Symmetry: C3
């Protein structure tokens, strides 16, 4: 049974894109006797609960395992000793002994000695998460983190209360990892594995060491670096038999850059692509651009797996248009506010409920009132669920100028719902067949977009027909069975 | 018996203006069954001795009491415990045990360990005031203050030897107050009352808490905020029955500001005058300007109390003219040096002994030599006593461009001595009746001032007559009995 | 027996100029019943070994003694106590007890506690020289130096890891010296002698105290300040009978300064020359310039002692020209590279092996390749020995624009070897008699220098004759016996 290892840095809840796609990939892979496991490199004491919530929310398969350096070496150190280190816990209590706890809030509480007249510590008692900011001469020297009534991590700060070193302890109370962080650049430098008496120059060396000790050197094990920041770690691994790949999930080109400069991260994975066993893209256009600029031969194009769920039941209604996209400078609805203003001049009754939070939200809502859209638009409260939310909604908007793959658009095709793409990143040129299915209009085409959106709403049955065969288009193009065959060819 | 509470921040020795006026006010108030007590907010271990010296120097009545937050809460904590905290004292001795005291001076002495090779502490043994600057890694971490062989206050410093926190102990050796000071802005921030397990955001909240716990909420108790910086503390008090007033002792207008901008402090007490029960002024002109710009209705005009002392006995003499005013940029004798130079060209024998120290003193004395007045002027050594000093002197000068009330001028009227005002702040338009009494000449009138001063000296008996009825003018206008009647009307 | 005291700051190995000259001076002085002792002011635990190596390398006489403040007061403190201070040593071991030593290199080793999770110390175990950089909150607080398994010196650093204080211990483990260093200006300030409970404002006061306690106040003892930086220390000595002198070994004029500004150090020794009993120069020209600008009367001219070694035996050969001079901006071979390029255009076979390291070396070697001299020149590897190295070499180059005394040139005269001076500092106008002996050509005379160098090589026997009587010239002018007679006249 082939053991694939999707490489990322973090895997938290309420996070889509690569995260969700990797979970989907794992399930489909395992369905064809190919163990799908995720490799993270972040520290989270709540990781157990996070992954549990995900599995329970059908956001990941139970077979999908998560390998993390911290947990791995924690278990190694847990077996080195037998007794519990009560030293730190006792010392903390003896410091806050006969102290006066001045509670500012219900959680916030500061400790003071009346006998030594010294500020001892600060405590924010969050649910089973007490954080003791220890003080010396009214200056923070340490910050003890707690979980399940056990010290999980301590942090030493400098004269500017900036992190200079982080420390990680096992479930026996002993140190296994010591990382020195540069106050400037905020970069994890000299890393020390005290559980194996080892010294690393960077976290890259530590993460590579972890991967070399976890993944055995056989062609039975594949490595799929989905994250563009974890690539340096898969490039330094001392493996010579394990195949390594790099899945690109986004536009390699920098956001809003007419210059046509490629993102530093993606540039590296494409310049040093002569070292990896393949670079996987989702769009044929992405391939053309990359395989021209970098002139690479390992440019393979296999799209992301997508579940067809079920068939909807003629859910017809209309109260508001919807972008259904997280607020992003270019990958949001910036110019779509102007489109809404134009539609308001025709039908003022038409509202606009676009879900998703972000930084642009502020200016967008301010510009709404400016363009007399205080009531004419009514953005949703980033409702977690979307499938059932807009199952009855049609005429979805897509003013993205830099998309990597139209996931939401391909989902609406299976939801028999029309779309209004701007065909500015060729992420929807594959899905929206213009007249046939959806509306692949040009970029900054507010005029044409307005007419299309209004007509689409008016012609209900007609628009449904366009989307109904659009489902079949998606089903055919992105056929799960066909996709994993391509993966197998690349892997083996 | 009405209990008035004059609110100021500090009350030290060798300090006039509000300080002296408040003491005078208290005496006169008490003479009419109205307890006159002063409220300070500063920390001074020597306060007992300071107030004793004042009472002994007839600079305050024995009935005038002083309420201070530090002392109040010190007594509260002194009753919480029974034994003495010898911990700190013993620890200090054990640190400086078998140490080598290298005495730089008679007072300055540094301690060094030959066994640990560490700089322990620095000690400046002033009379019963040992200050131990404790050192760690040749960097000051603490500064222990001593009084009556008891730790009174400790101070924790940062990497730049700048105060980050101050601590105050009781007479039992326990902490009752902890104040965090921002290294920048040098402002007392988060304040902690460990004697009552309370937390304050600023010293304003702590001082308001003190006033709310001291002054009961009845109309029998009045609050007279004489200090312009203590007003925010009387504005935040949770009293709803206690009447609050604001006495202005100075020109609200900024010093040397043709722009006519009002001092930020005074501006606040006049913009938020709609909250207090009255704003007391000393000059009718001050009222007109304030009651116009701020358009307030609670603008009352009652002048400061002044003692008539006794009647002089024709003390006639002349060796030097005298300004008898502390060196101040505009409230000093800047242009009066040019006046002196002009008089020298007429009578070179005429000397100029003006008492009072300041920053301007340097340039003034340098400009003296420049204007050939090295000997032609001979400033006095800021002799504390003035009443008896210039009792025999006549032709006093007043080149103040921004005075709030001519106290020295009104004193010379009772001393039957002529004056030479510049009528530039209308502080002397009330007293100096031009020809009748003194010489209320215009501003920058060196020419006219010279002629007036010379003539005044020459005509002795005539000048005395002008000042003799000037005493009666002051007596009538500023009649003690009449002033306290006005106060009573405002209070009740 | 007269006791002369040559005053310098440091006396390390592989160092010429004053250092070597002082050793030579001492030997010759002692040969005439005049004790020659060197006074240093630097701390070096290896000083014993350094001076031993020198004596063994015939680089100093066994009679030449070295007096150092550190050693002097160390012996004083060694007699104050009897037992050894094991405190520090034990405390160091107890800190690194049950610690995990993570060895980065063979020497570099860091210590970590798994029970307290704290970075303890850093250790670079050089041959019998363990340096423990003690750490607190991942910040360096101390640096313990070791020698013969004994703490010799500790150093306390600040928040910027910059020295704030240095500490020195005796052979019994007790502190005798504590010096506070300003992080800015890097200057030893307040100095404390804990062995004699004394306090000094600077190291000047401490070094003067040392000299006042070492040298008795009689005319039997002379002080020769050879070092220009130790002069302030001989100017503040409380001696009134001991004669003080100042030997100038270099050009008082600043390097590459057409302005003609005199070096601050030398300027001081010549402006405050009215205080010392004489200023000794090596060049009559130096005297003229100094005795004109400063108009001093104590300007004496006695040249440095030089050993005539033996007579060479017609060592004739030629493979490369040689400057035999440490790389220095103006006192090096900067323009001599252009001279070499010109010679290459005539004889490309001619190589150029100039010995001596420096900063200019980089640019010089780069400019070699630039001027097609990658192979045409071949600088030697700064071979310590020079006497025997180029004993067979002739036509030595001297493109120095600011020399104080042509030592190497005077050595080649005794080695019967021609020279090519630039007569730009008049250091060789005394030695090179142009046609008669060597070649005293003008400055920036690449043209003339080229012709001279080539002709000199061609005419072997002739060039030898010029150098053979040049030895006699040096022997006569710089006659050892004659020089010490001049010294005696000045001393007594
Ligand atoms: Cl135990
Ligand atoms: Cl216990
Ligand atoms: Cl490699
Ligand atoms: Cl006890
Ligand atoms: Cl005791
Ligand atoms: Cl309010
Ligand atoms: Cl012992
Ligand atoms: Cl032992
Ligand atoms: Cl002197």
């Amino acid at each position: 049974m082939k053991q694939t290892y999707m490489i990322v840095n973090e895997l938290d809840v309420n996070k889509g894109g690569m995260t969700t796609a990797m979970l989907t990939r794992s399930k489909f892979f395992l369905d064809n006797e190919i163990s799908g496991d995720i490799i993270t490199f972040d520290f989270k004491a709540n990781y157990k609960d996070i992954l549990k919530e995900l599995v329970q929310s059908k956001k990941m398969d139970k077979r999908t395992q998560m390998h993390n350096p911290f947990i791995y070496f924690k278990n190694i150190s847990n077996l080195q000793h037998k007794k519990y280190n009560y030293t730190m816990t006792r010392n903390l209590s003896n410091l806050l002994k006969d102290s006066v706890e001045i509670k500012e809030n219900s959680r916030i509480s500061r400790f003071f000695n009346i006998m030594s007249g010294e500020y001892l510590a600060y405590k924010r008692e969050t649910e089973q998460e007490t954080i003791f900011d220890l003080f010396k001469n009214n200056l923070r020297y340490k910050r003890i983190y707690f979980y399940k009534g056990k010290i999980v991590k301590t942090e030493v700060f400098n004269s500017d209360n900036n992190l200079i070193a982080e420390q990680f302890y096992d479930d026996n109370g002993y140190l296994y990892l010591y990382r020195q962080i540069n106050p400037e650049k905020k970069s994890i430098g000299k890393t020390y594995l005290v559980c194996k008496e080892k010294q690393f120059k960077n976290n890259v060396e530590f993460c590579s060491y972890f991967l070399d000790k976890l993944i055995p050197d056989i062609n039975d094990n594949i490595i799929i670096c989905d994250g563009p920041g974890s690539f340096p770690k898969i490039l330094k691994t001392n493996h010579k038999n394990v195949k390594k790949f790099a899945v690109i999930h986004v536009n390699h080109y920098k956001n809003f850059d007419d210059t046509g400069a490629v993102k530093k991260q993606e540039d590296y994975i494409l310049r040093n692509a002569n070292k990896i066993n393949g670079v996987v893209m989702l769009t044929e256009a992405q391939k053309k651009d990359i395989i021209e600029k970098y002139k690479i031969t390992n440019a393979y194009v296999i799209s992301n797996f997508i579940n067809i769920t079920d068939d909807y039941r003629d859910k017809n209604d209309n109260k508001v248009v919807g972008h259904i996209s997280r607020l992003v400078p270019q990958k949001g609805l910036p110019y779509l506010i102007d489109v809404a203003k134009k539609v308001v001049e025709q039908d003022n009754s038409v509202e606009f409920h676009l879900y998703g939070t972000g930084e642009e939200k502020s200016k967008i809502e301010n510009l709404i009132q400016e363009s007399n859209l205080t009531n004419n638009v009514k953005l949703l409260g980033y409702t977690t669920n979307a499938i059932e939310k807009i199952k009855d909604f049609r005429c979805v908007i897509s003013t993205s100028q830099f998309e990597g793959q139209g996931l939401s658009l391909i989902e609406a095709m299976l939801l028999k719902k029309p779309v209004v793409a701007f065909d500015v990143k060729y992420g929807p040129s594959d899905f929206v067949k213009d007249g046939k299915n959806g509306y692949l209009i040009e970029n900054k085409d507010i005029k044409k977009m307005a007419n299309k959106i209004l007509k689409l709403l008016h012609d209900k049955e007609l628009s449904k027909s366009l989307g109904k065969h659009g489902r079949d288009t998606i089903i055919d193009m992105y056929q799960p069975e066909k996709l994993m065959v391509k993966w197998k060819q690349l892997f083996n």
